[PDB]
């Protein structure tokens, strides 16, 4: 449920230096923190966010006992984020001149998250550190820090100017701050951070060290504080004697804006002065007025119209027996084409929570489907009043979990029976060999995957499925700009959004000559 | 065309031979043809209620038309199908309906095919709508209508040739004849088909009438492009394509509101005025607002539209990605179909065909940025090449083109609770494999019907036609529990013994 997040940002002087052509790490960290706080505020999440700055000229922290934990200030205590915090992040916070050890900052964040959560109930405690690791540190309290994280159940995430591992584009896909630029002090900081992440989580902790540019195009900041979906309990039935207790979650479900635009008067900025009403008028002349109680619902049947009252429809409606998840049969996986998937969601089906027998039975079914290369056609009804659907449940096996993925299949009435002219058989639209070779070269040049050497693994150069929806961040930016400066036009779309929405520059550069050949080989004329 | 309608005229002979029968169990040709027309009417009402249907009888004693030709009775003119026409046709259905038809319209009179086709042509020309198809279904069971008289037959062939010239498709729906219909005696040179595919004598009647009696209830929406966008390679090589929905969730028709007494459609108007004077609030004196807990953010409607604007409508080719990188479980919304258009950018079809061929050869998909229309945030889509597929009957099962697959964003995927993996022993997997092999079946896309929609159609038909009791639609999505219980047998018990402990439900 509610979670307590502490953002420990680096502010000292070394975080302000910039290589020309590359944005300063201070600005990138500010952008990442702004995105995080924007999402937290404008989604009205109940998570409480703190903000600790280390490296500032001043010193204001609970552990400031004198000649210790200096140049560290707790800018914002644990509370619900508000527009004020966004205002300080965007304008008030300024880079400092001193330096501080990031372990001291981690200890300060520990104390903030410890002696500010008593009384309040928090499901998760998270700390996100933004730093450049260019400052000298002392590894004297490392064991105590690790033990404190382990005992207090506090996560960790590290953000660095350089990725762990052409011109540099912030938020884009491709190379980042050069791997040679990392200095010896930065190397020592990186190795200490890596050892901390290893001792904290394990080998997967290496995946929790991100870069600012790659963080601006991922949801890694919200990964540890997001609330998982609720399960839908049912029973997988094969016949009237076999039943497996299952729980189904929603894997893919398009996210839309939750807050609605409220229509208000332009003079008073209030909504009670504006209301909407509907007037019922006969289609005949003179536009007579009809009240709600004098209208009965009817249906269209050819050229005639038949009255069909709501009570009559409810009595005549197709009655479903209720919630069900029943297997109709098993068919070869090649018979269920991917192009026929319907619906607006994808369900992943596990066994019932902490149920060993159900887990064994479901794993047996999944492995049986996988070995025979078959899928299950199931009848799925969410609720008693829900319209029953027919869908496909195909096995999905990974190195750590197994599940059945359910996608709705079409009914015979959802299929459209148009016919299209054949393209291959056409003698007027047949490309010649030169055009085919040109298109072949173009496809080769614009490849979005790298066939890695020494292993049969395809690396995705443009993994779009990890890119956040740009509309939400754009809307949050516009809303914040309007709230802070309600006298200016909407700002332009941020450059990193365009960078993260565009393919790597290598793809574009490699596809200039082939594209010119395509242009000079395919005459395209826009009809008047 | 798109706005064009389909015009169908049922030409039913009223000769005495049509009222005979070779067996009491068998239906006489007249009521069989009447049931044919009734099935067509019902299917068209469910599907294509915007089309035109007419019914004409020739060979009757009484005459009714716009020309006053003898022995021609136009029961219905070219008009949209309705329940009243269905009931009027039902008045002649079956036994005692044939008697009513013979009592109110004559039969056994001499006719002339040229006059019949003249009446049909006048019926086609009288109505003022724009139509794509002008079809005639001739219901008869006489090989040579004018076998004895040569002049009338010759005039008939001349008139049929004229109607073919002006665009009237003439079909033939012969009923049962004791001596065999013997097509190609007279009808060969008039029927609009290219040739008589079967030149036999056709002792039987069910040539294609079984297709007509077979009722399938589906809307059958006309073909129309969702958007005529532009596929841009970089910024200059721009081809014109069209987006179609090959699959779309069929919705129940929306109920209409009508007057309580007169039963006439009622128009709905919405108006907004301030609650201080009642003066209508023109959409230029109001603003959009959002209160985020304590602070109100005020934006013009133009600003709210502008903040959603990223790119111009069209598809921006980002690159090409191997098909193996497109995961099956990353389904977001139903995929679309991309087909080239030569009406806007001449030469688009050649480049589209080359791209399709090369993508099929290399098993790649064109990853593009999709903006369906103005002021809409873009998505990332994959154009997967889709080769034309023809079955054994050489029909287009799958059209050639591209399949536009929507790729989910990072926030369209939900994190899921951690679960300890509990694998199964090979014995249990083998038992479940046997169970799976027992219940194997062949799946086709058009194998299941929407029970809700079918029940709604049956209820509407019963209400309109005043049926005593509505027909209950058969729910094919219900598992055949008895059948699979008999098919499996003791496999379920053995599987439960292997997996489920003896104290589990």
């Amino acid at each position: 449920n509610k979670a307590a997040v502490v953002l420990c940002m680096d502010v000292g002087f070394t975080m302000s230096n910039s290589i020309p052509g590359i944005e300063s790490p201070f600005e990138q960290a500010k952008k990442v923190i702004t995105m995080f706080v924007q999402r937290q505020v404008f989604a009205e999440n109940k998570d409480e966010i703190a903000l600790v700055l280390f490296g500032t000229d001043g010193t204001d922290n609970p552990l400031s006992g004198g000649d210790q934990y200096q140049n560290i200030t707790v800018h914002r205590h644990l509370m619900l984020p508000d527009f004020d915090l966004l205002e300080d992040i965007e304008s008030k916070i300024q880079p400092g001149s001193q330096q501080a050890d990031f372990l001291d900052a981690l200890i300060v964040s520990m104390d903030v998250i410890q002696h500010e959560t008593i009384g309040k109930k928090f499901e998760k405690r998270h700390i996100e550190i933004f730093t450049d690791l260019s400052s000298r540190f002392s590894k004297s309290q490392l064991d105590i820090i690790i033990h404190s994280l382990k005992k207090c159940d506090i996560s960790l995430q590290f953000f660095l100017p350089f990725s762990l591992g052409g011109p540099f584009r912030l938020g884009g896909h491709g190379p980042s701050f050069p791997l040679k630029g990392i200095t010896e002090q930065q190397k020592e900081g990186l190795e200490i951070v890596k050892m901390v992440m290893i001792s904290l989580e394990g080998e997967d902790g290496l995946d929790e060290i991100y870069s600012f540019s790659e963080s601006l195009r991922k949801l890694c900041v919200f990964k540890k504080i997001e609330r998982h979906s609720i399960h839908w309990p049912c029973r997988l039935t094969i016949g009237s004697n076999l039943s497996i207790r299952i729980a189904a979650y929603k894997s893919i479900l398009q996210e839309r804006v939750k807050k609605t635009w409220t229509v208000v008067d332009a003079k008073t900025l209030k909504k009670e002065d504006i209301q909407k009403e509907t007037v019922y008028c006969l289609n005949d002349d003179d536009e007579t007025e009809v009240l709600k109680e004098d209208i009965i619902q009817g249906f269209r049947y050819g050229s005639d119209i038949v009255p069909f009252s709501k009570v009559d429809e409810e009595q005549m409606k197709y009655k479903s027996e209720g919630k069900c998840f029943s297997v109709l049969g098993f068919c070869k996986s090649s018979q269920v084409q991917r192009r026929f998937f319907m619906g607006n969601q994808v369900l992943k089906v596990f066994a019932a929570r902490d149920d060993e027998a159900a887990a064994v039975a479901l794993s047996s079914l999944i492995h049986a489907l996988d070995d025979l290369d078959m899928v299950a056609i199931v009848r799925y009804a969410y609720d008693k009043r829900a319209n029953p659907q027919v869908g496909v449940a195909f096995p999905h096996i990974k190195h750590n979990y197994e599940c059945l993925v359910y996608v709705q299949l079409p009914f015979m009435e959802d299929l459209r029976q148009y016919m299209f002219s054949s393209l291959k058989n056409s003698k007027k639209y047949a490309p010649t060999e030169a055009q085919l070779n040109a298109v072949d070269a173009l496809i080769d040049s614009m490849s979005l995957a790298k066939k890695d050497e020494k292993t049969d693994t395809l690396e995705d150069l443009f993994p779009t499925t990890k890119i956040p929806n740009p509309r939400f961040q754009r809307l949050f930016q516009c809303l914040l700009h309007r709230a802070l400066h309600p006298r200016e036009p909407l700002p332009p779309i941020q450059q990193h959004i365009w960078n993260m929405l565009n393919p790597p520059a290598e793809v574009t550069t490699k596809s200039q000559i082939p594209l010119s050949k395509i242009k000079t080989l395919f005459p395209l004329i826009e009809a008047k | 065309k798109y706005s064009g309608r389909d015009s169908l005229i049922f030409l039913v002979d009223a000769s005495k031979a049509m009222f005979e029968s070779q067996s009491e169990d068998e239906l006489t040709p007249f009521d069989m043809s009447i049931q044919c027309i009734q099935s067509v009417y019902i299917s068209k009402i469910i599907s294509s209620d915007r089309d035109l249907l007419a019914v004409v009888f020739y060979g009757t004693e009484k005459d009714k038309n716009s020309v006053n030709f003898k022995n021609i009775y136009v029961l219905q003119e070219l008009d949209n199908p309705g329940a009243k026409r269905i009931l009027e046709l039902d008045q002649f259905k079956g036994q005692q309906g044939q008697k009513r038809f013979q009592d109110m319209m004559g039969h056994g009179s001499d006719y002339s095919l040229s006059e019949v086709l003249w009446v049909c042509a006048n019926l086609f020309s009288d109505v003022q709508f724009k139509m794509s198809h002008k079809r005639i279904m001739l219901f008869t069971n006489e090989d040579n209508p004018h076998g004895n008289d040569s002049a009338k037959a010759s005039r008939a062939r001349t008139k049929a040739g004229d109607l073919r010239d002006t665009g009237i498709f003439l079909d033939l729906m012969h009923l049962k004849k004791p001596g065999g219909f013997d097509i190609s005696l007279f009808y060969r040179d008039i029927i609009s088909i290219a040739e008589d595919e079967d030149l036999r004598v056709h002792f039987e009647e069910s040539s294609k009438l079984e297709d007509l009696l077979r009722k399938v209830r589906a809307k059958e929406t006309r073909k129309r492009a969702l958007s005529r966008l532009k596929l841009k390679l970089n910024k200059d090589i721009v081809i014109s394509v069209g987006i179609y929905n090959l699959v779309q969730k069929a919705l129940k028709p929306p109920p209409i509101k009508l007057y309580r007494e007169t039963n006439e459609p009622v128009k709905t108007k919405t108006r907004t005025f301030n609650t201080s004077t009642g003066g209508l609030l023109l959409p230029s004196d109001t603003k959009r607002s959002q209160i985020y807990g304590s602070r109100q953010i005020i934006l013009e409607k133009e600003e709210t539209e502008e903040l959603k604007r990223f790119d111009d409508p069209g598809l921006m080719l980002m690159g090409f990605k191997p098909l193996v990188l497109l995961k099956k479980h990353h389904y977001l919304r139903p995929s679309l179909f991309v087909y080239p258009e030569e009406s806007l950018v001449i030469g688009s079809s050649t480049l589209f065909s080359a791209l399709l061929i090369k993508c099929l050869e290399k098993e790649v998909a064109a990853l593009c940025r999709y903006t369906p229309r103005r002021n809409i945030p873009p998505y990332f889509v994959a154009l997967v090449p889709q080769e034309e597929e023809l079955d054994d009957q050489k029909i287009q099962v799958t059209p050639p083109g591209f399949q536009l697959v929507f790729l989910p964003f990072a926030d369209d995927k939900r994190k899921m609770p951690f679960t300890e993996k509990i694998m199964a022993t090979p014995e249990q997997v083998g038992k479940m494999k046997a169970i799976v092999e027992k219940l194997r079946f062949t799946y086709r896309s058009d194998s299941f019907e929407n029970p809700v929609l079918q029940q709604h159609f049956r209820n509407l038909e019963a209400l309109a036609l005043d049926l005593m009791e509505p027909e209950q639609a058969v729910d094919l999505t219900l598992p055949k529990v008895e059948a699979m219980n008999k098919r499996l047998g003791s496999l379920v018990d053995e599987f439960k013994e292997l997996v489920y402990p003896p104290d589990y439900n």
Partner: peptide, 23 residues
């Protein structure tokens, strides 16, 4: 055109559903 429906010209003929039929 092969496989064209008689009721609705320009469209493909819809075959009966059939449902699930075990082998």
């Amino acid at each position: 055109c092969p496989g064209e429906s008689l009721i609705n010209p320009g469209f493909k003929s819809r075959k009966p559903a059939g449902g699930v039929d075990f082998d």
